[PDB]
Amino acid sequence: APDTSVSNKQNFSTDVIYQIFTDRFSDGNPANNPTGAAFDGTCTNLRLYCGGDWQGIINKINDGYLTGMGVTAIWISQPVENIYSIINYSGVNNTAYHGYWARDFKKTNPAYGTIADFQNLIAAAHAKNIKVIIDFAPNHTSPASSDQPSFAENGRLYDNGTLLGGYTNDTQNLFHHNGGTDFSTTENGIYKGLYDLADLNHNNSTVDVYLKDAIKMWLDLGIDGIRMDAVKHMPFGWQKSFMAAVNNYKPVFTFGEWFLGVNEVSPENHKFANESGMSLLDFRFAQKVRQVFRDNTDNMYGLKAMLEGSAADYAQVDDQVTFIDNHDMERFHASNANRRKLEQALAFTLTSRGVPAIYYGTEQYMSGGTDPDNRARIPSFSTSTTAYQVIQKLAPLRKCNPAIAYGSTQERWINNDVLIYERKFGSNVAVVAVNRNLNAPASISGLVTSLPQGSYNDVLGGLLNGNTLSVGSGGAASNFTLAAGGTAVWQYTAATATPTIGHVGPMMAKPGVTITIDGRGFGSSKGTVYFGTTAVSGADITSWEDTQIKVKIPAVAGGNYNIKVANAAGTASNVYDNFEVLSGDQVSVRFVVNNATTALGQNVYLTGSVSELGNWDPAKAIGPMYNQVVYQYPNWYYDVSVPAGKTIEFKFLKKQGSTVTWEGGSNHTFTAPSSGTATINVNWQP
């Protein structure tokens, strides 16, 4: 099947995601609606259930609301069973309508539907070429208090009906008892509870194995993607071992939520996106777009810096999921603001790099402050709004113009309020012009593009006051005026003759797993796939066509490789780097080193005899290690993903900048468990 097929679970760059808050979308089956003080059919009390369910989503997929909009993928609320308790926070009642208060990850939330309804959702969705993504929050269970075992459900966790434990009297140690986080540091936000939510302890083998078996159930139900909740609050080492469990079984596009505020650029956020096995929601992109198009606290020069910077910090910037708002932010559209601002933001996002995600109701101009006002029931299913049509015109372009799905980004014209960028991929080009100034037109002269000589009509058809572009020799565009609030999209598409890799997924897996390589110009007959210098051809290449290649990862040593293909004629393609081959199945192990004193700015790291530990290369050491919560300096600890059942040699080192100080003595040695977790405690050797 082609790279744009609905069956492509490893690539979402040609798709447009529609985020649905199940409960606030459509009540297709009133028979499963909660009752009593936990229900409000008028949906005036935004903290109780309103009735939205999966049957309702199915109806909206069948009457053409979503398909007519150009949507090709939906992201729904966590499907697992939540608590049934109505929590009272100072007078106001609260329900798990949002789906983030899990009690059993192997069952469904009755309010949304049964396992059967879920299967029908997958069938109905796929039938209309729509992929299904589920939210998954393995960081915690539900609101709990060790003091009030009566409060809510004490954060109790069940394994398909069978009770495993509660937050109070947690002798089994399923949860963390370190207090609550203040978001002061990364370590603090990971090992301490998020708000009043029972923080799960992934170092516990029962919890580790339980969550990995639970996710496999949903993979077998046929989901196409996964949005990991609060990935910023779980051990990165464990999450990497979790992504390996997913990728070594049934690979699916996964992205996590790492919240970033305005003007916040975190090096840790980047490192997590580059080597954890999953991508991330692009908060850096979302916050900047808000500053330039919504609040006007930054100009087009700041938007340009964000685009150029992110393309350098993210190894696979094309996997980051973009958006302009969500369930944790004020609706982009302010009730009194001009609508053209939301429209331009949509046009910008839909034609930019990454995977576009639209929050439900955006196309209907919904307004609303922070939670829960930003989660009101969608007011109507009208297709006559301007925003609906903008999405309708641009969404399909990610499927037919690979320049938008996999293309590079380049600034071709710019000033305070105007930005004209070009997307390019092979023989495909897309030029987008945006003028945020709603009161002043702009005289654009000196615009150069990669577009062939000729005339180009605005793809938006002038919907946002766009105009026709007249291009001469050398791609030099003829002078023209860009209307106030103007937005135009011009493009050119043609067959690509040279093999061009536009995407690869998964980006981390053990030998034997099949990966998907998408692009253009691969030819119709089998060629060769290279993992570094190792050539792969013949049977191990399960399928090969012009836009997609499926090949099994060769049994090579664990490490980082560059992917490269060649058609039957032997013409090589571009290189796609940062692909990681695991040493085998993974397990999460906690390393602890005692009496490792250091000087300010100097930190302790871990290195070892396997690729998962950097193969003795200080530049690839694991760390910095933690020393505040679970263990305190001079004792350091860190959760690492390592090959299961392998005997590993390792040493710790202190690093200040690129200056390394090795641990004395011989290597420490140990054999990782074949399953579950383990904790290695050793002393620093002088």
Ligand X SMILES: OC[C@H]1O[C@H](O[C@H]2[C@H](O)[C@@H](O)[C@@H](O)O[C@@H]2CO)[C@H](O)[C@@H](O)[C@@H]1O
Ligand Y SMILES: OC[C@H]1O[C@H](O[C@H]2[C@H](O)[C@@H](O)[C@@H](O[C@H]3[C@H](O)[C@@H](O)[C@@H](O)O[C@@H]3CO)O[C@@H]2CO)[C@H](O)[C@@H](O)[C@@H]1O
Ligand Z SMILES: OC[C@H]1O[C@H](O[C@H]2[C@H](O)[C@@H](O)[C@@H](O[C@H]3[C@H](O)[C@@H](O)[C@H](O)O[C@@H]3CO)O[C@@H]2CO)[C@H](O)[C@@H](O)[C@@H]1O
Choose among ligand Z, ligand X, ligand Y, none what residue 651 binds, the Cβ cut-off being 5 to 8 Å by kind: ligand Z
Q: How far apart are CA 145 and CA 143, in angstroms?
A: 7
Choose among Ca ion, ligand Z, ligand Y, none what residue 616 binds, the Cβ cut-off being 5 to 8 Å by kind: ligand Z
Selected from 122, 337, 414, 536, the binder of ligand X by CB under 6 A is 414
Selected from 8, 19, 22, 33, the binder of Ca ion by CB under 5 A is 33
Shortest Cβ contact with ligand Y: which residue? 598
Among the listed residues 23, 27, 229, 325, the single catalytic one is 229
Pairing verdict, β 668-671 and 647-656: antiparallel
Choose among ligand X, ligand Z, Ca ion, none what residue 548 binds, the Cβ cut-off being 5 to 8 Å by kind: none
Closest CA to 461 of 523, 390, 400, 403: 390
- Asked if 79 and 120 count as a contact pair (C-beta separation under 8 A), the reply is no
- Asked if 648 and 609 count as a contact pair (C-beta separation under 8 A), the reply is yes
Q: How far apart are CA 223 and CA 214, in angstroms?
A: 13
- Which residue, 236 or 413, has its beta carbon nearer to ligand X? 413
Choose among ligand X, Ca ion, ligand Y, none what residue 649 binds, the Cβ cut-off being 5 to 8 Å by kind: none
Choose among Ca ion, ligand Y, ligand Z, none what residue 480 binds, the Cβ cut-off being 5 to 8 Å by kind: none
**Residue 601, interface with ligand Y (CB under 6 A)?**
yes
**Residue 199, interface with Ca ion (CB under 5 A)?**
yes
- Which residue, 168 or 603, has its beta carbon nearer to ligand Y? 603
Selected from 628, 661, 667, 683, the binder of ligand Y by CB under 6 A is 628
- Cβ neighbours of residue 380 closer than 8 Å, sequence gap 6 or more: 364
Selected from 301, 616, 633, 670, the binder of ligand Z by CB under 6 A is 616
- Which residue, 550 or 620, has its beta carbon nearer to ligand Z? 620
Selected from 662, 669, 674, 681, the binder of ligand Z by CB under 6 A is 662
- Which residue, 231 or 653, has its beta carbon nearer to ligand Z? 653
Closest CA to 136 of 106, 173, 175: 106
Selected from 274, 415, 457, 683, the binder of ligand X by CB under 6 A is 415
Closest CA to 76 of 42, 100, 41: 100
Choose among ligand X, ligand Y, Ca ion, none what residue 414 binds, the Cβ cut-off being 5 to 8 Å by kind: ligand X
Q: Which two tokens stand for residue 609?
A: 């005899």
**Residue 89, interface with ligand Z (CB under 6 A)?**
no
List the Cα angle 481/485/490 in 5-degree steps.
60
**Residue 627, interface with ligand Y (CB under 6 A)?**
yes
Min. distance of Cβ 23 from Ca ion in angstroms?
8
Closest CA to 630 of 588, 592, 595: 592
Q: Which long-range contacts (CB under 8 A, 24 or more apart) does 632-635 make?
A: 633/598, 634/594, 634/595, 634/596, 634/597, 634/598, 635/592, 635/593, 635/594, 635/595, 635/596
Q: Give the DSSP H/E element, type plus range, for residue 616.
A: none
Quickly list DSSP for 323-377: -S--TTS--SS-TTS-THHHHHHHHHHHTSSSEEEEETTGGGT----STTGGGPP
Q: What is the per-residue burial (b if ≥16 Cβ within 10 Å, else e) of 337-346?
A: eeebbbbbbb
Choose among ligand X, ligand Y, ligand Z, none what residue 312 binds, the Cβ cut-off being 5 to 8 Å by kind: none
- Is 257 considered catalytic here? yes
**Residue 51, interface with Ca ion (CB under 5 A)?**
yes
Min. distance of Cβ 451 from ligand Z in angstroms?
52
Q: Between the CA of residue 456 and those of 347, 463, 472, 490, 594, what are the distances in Å?
A: 18, 15, 11, 6, 67
- Asked if 11 and 518 count as a contact pair (C-beta separation under 8 A), the reply is yes
Q: Give the DSSP H/E element, type plus range, for residue 121.
A: helix 115-127
Min. distance of Cβ 149 from ligand Z in angstroms?
50
- Which residue, 212 or 654, has its beta carbon nearer to ligand Y? 654
Min. distance of Cβ 442 from ligand X in angstroms?
9
Among the listed residues 257, 298, 363, 417, the single catalytic one is 257
- Cβ neighbours of residue 281 closer than 8 Å, sequence gap 6 or more: 227, 255, 256, 257, 258, 320, 321, 323, 357
Q: How far apart are CA 635 and CA 380, in angstroms?
A: 58
Choose among Ca ion, ligand Y, ligand X, none what residue 633 binds, the Cβ cut-off being 5 to 8 Å by kind: ligand Y
Query: Number of residues in contact with Ca ion, rule: CB under 5 A?
Result: 9
Q: How far apart are CA 302 and CA 292, in angstroms?
A: 8
List the Cα angle 246/283/385 in 5-degree steps.
100
- Is 371 considered catalytic here? no
Min. distance of Cβ 640 from ligand Z in angstroms?
17
**Residue 659, interface with ligand Y (CB under 6 A)?**
no
- 675 secondary structure, DSSP code: S
Min. distance of Cβ 449 from ligand X in angstroms?
10
Which residues make beta-bridge pairs with 550? 516, 543
Choose among ligand Z, ligand X, ligand Y, none what residue 601 binds, the Cβ cut-off being 5 to 8 Å by kind: ligand Y
Site string for Ca ion, 122-151 (x = CB under 5 A): -----------------x------------
Residue with tokens 């979308």: 25
Min. distance of Cβ 242 from ligand Z in angstroms?
29
**Residue 188, interface with ligand Y (CB under 6 A)?**
no
- Which residue, 432 or 644, has its beta carbon nearer to ligand X? 432
- Which residue, 82 or 310, has its beta carbon nearer to Ca ion? 82
Q: Give the DSSP H/E element, type plus range, for residue 391.
A: helix 386-394
Selected from 233, 564, 651, 655, the binder of ligand Z by CB under 6 A is 651
**Residue 233, interface with Ca ion (CB under 5 A)?**
yes
| Contact window for ligand Y (CB under 6 A) among 225-233, 333-341, 476-484, 626-634 | 626-634
Min. distance of Cβ 625 from ligand Y in angstroms?
9
**Residue 661, interface with ligand Z (CB under 6 A)?**
no
Q: How far apart are CA 401 and CA 632, in angstroms?
A: 53
**Residue 437, interface with ligand X (CB under 6 A)?**
no
Q: How far apart are CA 662 and CA 222, in angstroms?
A: 48
Shortest Cβ contact with Ca ion: which residue? 53
**Residue 667, interface with ligand Z (CB under 6 A)?**
yes
| Contact window for ligand Y (CB under 6 A) among 120-128, 174-182, 305-313, 599-607 | 599-607
- Asked if 578 and 560 count as a contact pair (C-beta separation under 8 A), the reply is yes
Closest CA to 84 of 122, 36, 146: 36
Choose among Ca ion, ligand Z, ligand X, none what residue 448 binds, the Cβ cut-off being 5 to 8 Å by kind: ligand X
Selected from 37, 400, 448, 555, the binder of ligand X by CB under 6 A is 448
Min. distance of Cβ 104 from Ca ion in angstroms?
19
Choose among ligand Y, Ca ion, ligand Z, none what residue 600 binds, the Cβ cut-off being 5 to 8 Å by kind: ligand Y
Q: How far apart are CA 430 and CA 450, in angstroms?
A: 9
For the chain, give the number of residues.
686
- Which residue, 26 or 627, has its beta carbon nearer to ligand Y? 627
Q: Angle of helix 340-350 relative to helix 386-394, nearest 10 degrees?
A: 10
Q: Point out the residues that are catalytic.
A: 229, 257
The residues that touch ligand X, with contacts defined as CB under 6 A, are 411-415, 446, 448
Give residues in contact with ligand Z (CB under 6 A): 616, 651, 662, 664, 667
Task: List residues near Ca ion by CB under 5 A.
Answer: 27, 29, 32-33, 51, 53, 139, 199, 233
Q: Which residues bind ligand Y (CB under 6 A)?
A: 598-603, 627-628, 633
